[PDB]
Design a protein around this nucleic acid. Sequence first.
DNA 1: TAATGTCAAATATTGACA
DNA 2: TGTCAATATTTGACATTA
Lengths: 97, 94
Amino acid sequence: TAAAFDDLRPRLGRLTEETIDIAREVLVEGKSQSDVARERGLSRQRVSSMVKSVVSAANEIPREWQRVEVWLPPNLAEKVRQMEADAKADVARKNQL
Amino acid sequence: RPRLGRLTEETIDIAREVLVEGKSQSDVARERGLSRQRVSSMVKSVVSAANEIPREWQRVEVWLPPNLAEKVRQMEADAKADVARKNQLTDAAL
DNA sequence: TAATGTCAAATATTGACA
DNA sequence: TGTCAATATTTGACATTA
């Protein structure tokens, strides 16, 4: 991952900067998981899960999708909510090989 | 009937810690001895009046294909401008 | 087995809708 | 208050190398 990372940041919401900074040392800077885990006082399992979060977030949402923050009646708030689930579901089974 | 000036002073005091002082909801909750659910609803009433939308309305932030993203972006419009019509004409249920 | 990375389970906290 | 999902974490086990 190069400047592809810096383009993943919007979709890297819900994660913190340390979780993002840490995974960037691995995916872009080429550092090792176990090395940075010792650098920032962490289990090597967390740094595994940290990047896997950053990585999966890439596969979960294509860069074409748009981020929309909207206030709705409770009836229709579930609809858009549920349709994103069905929309992420449809992207998910395409990853297959 | 106004909406921001309608609320109890404590809610505006609670919500000021969250939104202005940057404090967390659970923080001000334990600070003023209330549940973290009460502070969430307390703040929400402020954000819904500042959003001039119904209080029962729920926010939804979501990633969606652009086709369906303009679909939902239109729903907010056909809701903001739906209640806007119900306020002046439902009194004409005569 | 030393070293790394992943799968797994399980903890605490927050902020959401009921 | 109950509950859930998503964070922030942990140890333990385990496949895989050199």
